[PDB]
């Protein structure tokens, strides 16, 4: 009876929902936060626009602030990024969502825009959970009198939360928000240890290429490059890390990877004369991990290596300048997100060409496009954050304040230690981890309580 | 020269061929000496050091000699000193009163001799510190020196703590550094230096076969995240116990087995409460956390025959070694290594298969029974104690009235273009290169193309 | 062209894209393709051959044909084939029966159409083996057959010894290369081929974080040692069973806890054998022998609830799978990955917690839930399958007078000098470079500059 | 007690109690001491026995005596043996003649010591040997000795070479079993051994950080292997070098770079051939090969300023330290550490920056700046060593008949059933359990249920 949703084929509803349920058992701190709050309700009345990678992960999210009280309106964050049976299993048990795997971009600005209107007027939205900003700026942008009802943006990603304090900078920023990607159960979890889990996998998956043995290059060293030089160096590849940032290239230096650059002595001057190409000519695969534009531009396409890969892990396709690509040269695909390019020329390719590199996903979050992201365990904590978030922002009720109380209030703020602690004893429990109590005599030797928090807020863990 | 006291001075030569090596190893050190040499920023600066007299430490106190200090120095150790290196800088015309094997009361007289010239308080003006006993023995004895004294520049997380309670309970009388949390000493020094030099240590000391063995690691910050990766690398079996559920988290997801030494994790002091079945597969126990008794008497007990017990956290109380002391046996193996028979305390059998193996008599294991960390690591921490050292005294606290004292009074840390500073001299000790933004990419991410890269907030 | 049977054939242009991908990472299969085709070694051959019909065994049948031979394909196992490979193997006008998710029947009638052209037996004369029931259905169902076969080369452990069994019986009927036992085959293909791919079969089949979870690798062969460091490079916490003392030394200098299912090791068939401490932590459980049940009941039943099943060995028995059709209720949640519910056999709770998760029901995982060794590694093992192809062909075995015959009716290997010099186009493959031994070297050593470079003694 | 010579006797109670530790650390050793200690099976055994003087050949002394052997002992390198150990080893009656740091006179000297009692050849006969040069001078200069002895028993690669040389040549004259290639020894000793001890002996030496730093490893077989590992797991960035195309690959697959010193690998002789830009970014290079000039003069001058250079194959001829000697000047920086100076032969500056530094001037680094592989892993091949010399012993060659002796006349390995009894008795050290096959298991796989477990072809 329920129609209003669109995803690519309902009929693999029963499917995704065989996945949900396993997915849940690989999700403790998510689901401890289900089975605690069902009771009151804490989100009873929310009204969340939703906009974050329809997988299965976030399948659990999405019926666990439900199961907590909310109605939602759904949408994925990138046109490849879907899974259809988690899609499909959501738009089943009644929930509006407007997501598939390899929409085109108008596409999704469509799908957004169905989650912030209903019957084509807008919602009555009263909460944001997004992954990246995107939605965010449309509200902003387009629709700002729904900000006047809202309480609050959650902020699941780097880029995201970038942009919000940008706009609060400016003055710009309507709602408060939570960044949910500096809790260290998000940041010091998914964004490294969930790149190393499927990074790797997403390679695999799209070329089948050992990895043993071949050189690459990582562009980056923040959480996703750290997690993804460790998928890759773990797997016998010979790993090189370029960063703009000394600190984080000292610690690629003692990780045991060499630092070097694209470009001579370190200076990009926009020439061909400026690239190493002595060391791209050597490189079998370049990953971009920035959250930056045109880190791997097209003077470096230029002189990889015949027959490499070329992907990108951080948020947007712009790492990789694959404007360059479409405009001068061939793509010839292998298979759903797999091309390669052809550097002979612009239409037309010889078939048996040898000069081509390997794009994947066409340059959009590879983890997401050709495997599908972050594993259920790991998702978990991001998730649970995101619950916590929403709750809070919720009860606080923004909107609704005095004045002088919103202008108080107007802030991008992380969540108390004692909930990313309680995030992550739920995750360790999963593990069939102990954690040890401190007796008191301990608890007062280094000055916490035996029940935490266990670190000062300068800790960086 | 007489003014110092050290194991002995015919070390020093060969003491200085190993500072000729270290300092080609410390390039973000000696690059200050090169940087601030001419403008002199430490000429007047009087600086009571208390910190491991290592040949590491020897590059620190020349690189501060350098830039104008004068300093009087000891070892905030018993078994840290490298006698080589203390010779060296008592041969250079240095007061350093330092060796390794120091008894606890000459731990103290060294201690009493940097304060004390001639009989009288130096007229000190800055501290630099590991550990906090120095600025303990300041606060409570000698509370007039630190009204001349200008800052106080902390090595480690133990001092930090120290620090910290002071100035919560306002009891803290001058400025600090906490050198410990740039990313360049806490996520380099705590947590590299701990890889490099514990199994390190426990082969000099031992020389067991680690791969294939069963570790238990007590801690997993730093300290505790370095030690287990010093294992795991050998190829132990590692299991790591926490109180912290996030760096449990994080244990857990670098691939280690998360366990208590209790049952449900509760320390009730009983027997019953030791996991046996656990600590009876356990060949080595290392404590990494700054807390108190982490490896308990009952769990001295309840050790697999023969298991290796150590510490690397700052202090020897980490492990019940009193209880040892007053229950069993020890035996000499060699200097820093002791056989402790379980059998009890009236002499043993020279057979006894019912022993463990203590490590440093429980104190620093890293420095005890080898060198500590290696200088390119070193590197970071000191140039990072050397530029501590310039912004406190060029600040002049103790010039200032009280009430603009009291505004003054701050724990904190260098900012963090420091910071960036001296790992850009790490990495090009690597032969590291770092890429340099655009105008166009620096403004996309909204830093300069000179950084800081990074929101004070970011944790790397 | 008619003359195959495939899943779709619309598939080919896909299947031909990823070909000539596969070219460029197999070297030394395609430096022999470009090698031989002048001569055209194998004209006149006639090969049935039988083994998994991937991208990779597309690119061995090519090289088969284009160096002069005819063949007749199908796959050793009912999941491995990729049907884009199969689709553009039929597409060339080659005669293949494969389709991934094949049943037992459709299986034998595969192979059957291998052997029959038109009804009758095709005029054979080589054969190519992965596993030995291509093999055993010749020697067993069409003896007359094997009469005008000149040799087998067989690819992989379980059917070596398949072969070695019939040699000793009496028997074996024709001569055979043990392609497995080439170094550039058994140190490449059967350890670094599963670390590839064992995770990547368990990820595409679950999606399961592997980091900070309990692992138990049955076997440390070359298949155990691989698998083990697939899941150990993720950050599993990995523990190896063996029977084998000199694999198990191995395995915990390779920082493995070597256990077993087993108290103290012994199998009685009880359940009160069972160590259900250890089975009940276990989260994956993955059998490498070929061996029979190595996975048993009273182990299944025993195993933490949710865990995941799985067999990388050549044949689903290493697995009592049938005792979990007999006894539990399965429930698909995708074509190669099944939830076993524990709670009976009759229909199962949707939401029931008490099951196993098997993969690929029981078969080689990494081709049954992914797509098998990546292509550089296949490149060794297909080069040592063309060339023993080529020796087998070029001896002409079935045309010898009976005592020549007698002579030459053996299990033999390929010799060092050709194993050698497929690695070294591996090695160019990765960009490597081999140092040339100067003459006074390999006068010191005692070996030719050219090779070979070691013993027939030694193990690599 | 006179017939000895050792350093300082008054180490023996240290090594006492070191060898006490060892004995815990060596499980299948002292079990076989257990086991045959009743039987005395080398009672009138006369062994000449010249191998590393450690701790660990200690407990394989004593366990040779208490089977019934007299021994006569020298050590096979100048800077390997543990002088505490020599001590021990003296003080129990027990000829020894060895010291760290002997003279190359001295070196030969100690040898003849155990060759004479009073003056006169001893009443030898069996040979333990570690590279041969015992070997060698008994067949060079003491041909009348071998008359009356049955065996040689010989622990290294090197040294089997030699044997195998011999025998190819004719002049071997008494059967010698091949120790190195029983798997409880060549890949346990040659590869772990080297594991352990290479990054321990360079971290002794110099106290450098590794990690991040830049290394070349000069082979890849057993020691090649180790030594890699060792590196790596430190975090240094490595790059192997080979002649055998197969152990490249391996390198490959394992996670290295494969690269040559010389430009596509041709060693021409001269400067022009050398890849100046890849010696030019190393900072440690380490020979593994067993063969000759593998670190030649050309790669000395190109070798990145402050380069660490070391040898961990048996000899020193791996490295040109000859050219050394002739052109550079050399600073001793402590014992077993030289700084060479490439600025000329006539002195040096103490503060110039061209130099090298290499460990124990060339000599088996581990031993030397360490303490060699740890009893665990010597345990194994010291296990080896005793059934060798029962086996030989028993055998009595010497006494045989002439048809007799000209078919055991032969270097030959122990059976695959000892080598998995040693290996058992190293898992159980551990606390491993191995599996007991069943009886349908065994019949499944073709084995006797109590092993041996893999053909004589199987490579581990
Ligand atoms: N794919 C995923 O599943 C996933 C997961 C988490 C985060 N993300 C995204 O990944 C990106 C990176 O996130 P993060 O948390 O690691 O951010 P981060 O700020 O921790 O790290 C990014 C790093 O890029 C470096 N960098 C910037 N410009 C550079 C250049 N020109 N060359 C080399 N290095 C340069 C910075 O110095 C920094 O250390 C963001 O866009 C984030 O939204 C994606
Ligand atoms: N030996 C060295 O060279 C060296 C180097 C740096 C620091 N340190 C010292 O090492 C210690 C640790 O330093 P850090 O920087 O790692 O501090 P840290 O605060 O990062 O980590 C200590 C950890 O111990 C844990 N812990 C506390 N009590 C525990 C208990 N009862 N059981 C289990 N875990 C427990 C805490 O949760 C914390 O994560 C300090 O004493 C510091 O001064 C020594
Ligand atoms: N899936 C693949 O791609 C692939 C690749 C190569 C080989 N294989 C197959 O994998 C299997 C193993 O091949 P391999 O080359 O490693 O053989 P192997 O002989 O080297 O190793 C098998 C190991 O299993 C051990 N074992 C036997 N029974 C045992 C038991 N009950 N418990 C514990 N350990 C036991 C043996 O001791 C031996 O070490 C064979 O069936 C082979 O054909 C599969
Ligand atoms: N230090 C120790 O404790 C220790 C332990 C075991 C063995 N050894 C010694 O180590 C040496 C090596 O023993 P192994 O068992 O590894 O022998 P191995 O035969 O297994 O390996 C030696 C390797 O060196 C390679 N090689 C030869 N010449 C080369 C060259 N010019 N460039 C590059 N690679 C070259 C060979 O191809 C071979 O793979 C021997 O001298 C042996 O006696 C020392
Ligand atoms: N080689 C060394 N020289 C001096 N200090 C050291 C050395 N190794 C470790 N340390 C210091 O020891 C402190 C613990 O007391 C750490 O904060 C660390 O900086
Ligand atoms: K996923
Ligand atoms: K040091
Ligand atoms: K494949
Ligand atoms: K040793
Ligand atoms: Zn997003
Ligand atoms: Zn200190
Ligand atoms: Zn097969
Ligand atoms: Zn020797």
């Given at each position: 009876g329920f129609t209003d949703y669109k995803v690519a084929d309902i009929t693999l509803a029963a499917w995704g929902r065989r996945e949900l349920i396993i997915a849940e058992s690989e999700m403790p701190a998510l689901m401890g936060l289900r089975r605690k709050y069902a009771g009151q309700q804490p989100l009873k009345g929310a009204k969340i626009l939703g906009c974050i990678h329809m997988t299965i992960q976030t399948g659990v999210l999405i019926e666990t602030l439900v199961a907590l009280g909310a109605e939602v309106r759904w949408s994925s964050c990138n046109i490849f990024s879907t899974q259809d049976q988690a899609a499909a299993a959501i738009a089943a048990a009644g929930i509006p969502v407007f997501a598939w795997k390899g929409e085109t971009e108008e596409e999704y600005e469509w799908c957004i825009e169905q989650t912030i209107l209903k019957d084509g007027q807008p919602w009555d939205a009263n909460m944001v959970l997004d992954d990246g900003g995107d939605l965010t700026e449309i509200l902003h942008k387009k629709y700002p009198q729904m900000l006047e009802r809202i309480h609050g943006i959650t902020e699941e990603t780097t880029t995201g939360v970038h942009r919000l304090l940008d706009m609060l900078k400016n003055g710009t920023l309507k709602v408060p928000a939570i960044n949910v990607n500096d809790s260290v159960t998000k940041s010091k979890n998914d964004n490294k240890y969930g790149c190393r889990h499927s990074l790797n996998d997403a390679i695999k998956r799209g070329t089948?290429?050992?990895?043993?043995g071949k050189q690459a290059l990582v562009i980056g060293y923040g959480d996703v490059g750290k997690g993804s030089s460790q998928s890759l160096r773990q797997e016998g590849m010979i790993v090189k890390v370029a960063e703009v940032d000394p600190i984080c290239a000292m610690q690629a230096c003692m990780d045991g990877f060499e630092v070097v650059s694209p470009y001579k002595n370190g200076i990009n001057d926009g020439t061909e004369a400026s690239i190493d190409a002595a060391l791209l000519g050597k490189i079998d695969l370049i990953v971009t991990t920035t959250?930056?534009?045109?880190?791997?531009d097209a003077n470096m396409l230029k002189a990889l290596k015949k027959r490499a890969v070329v992907c990108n892990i951080g948020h947007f396709d712009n790492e990789i300048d694959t404007a360059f690509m479409r405009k001068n040269w061939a793509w010839e695909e292998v298979k759903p997100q797999v091309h390669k390019i052809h550097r002979t020329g612009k239409d037309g390719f010889d078939?048996?060409?040898?000069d081509y590199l390997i794009l994947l996903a066409e340059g959009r979050l590879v983890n997401l496009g050709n495997a599908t992201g972050h594993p259920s365990r790991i998702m978990d904590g991001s998730f649970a954050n995101q619950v916590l978030a929403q709750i809070h922002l919720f009860e606080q009720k923004y909107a609704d304040l005095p004045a002088a109380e919103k202008a108080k209030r107007l802030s991008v703020e992380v969540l108390p230690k004692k909930l990313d602690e309680e995030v992550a004893l739920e995750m360790v429990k999963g593990f069939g981890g102990v954690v040890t109590q401190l007796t008191p005599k301990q608890a007062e030797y280094i000055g916490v309580s035996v029940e935490g928090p266990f670190k000062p807020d300068t800790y960086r863990y």
């Open positions: 089948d290429h050992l990895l043993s959250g930056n534009v045109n880190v791997c078939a048996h060409n040898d």
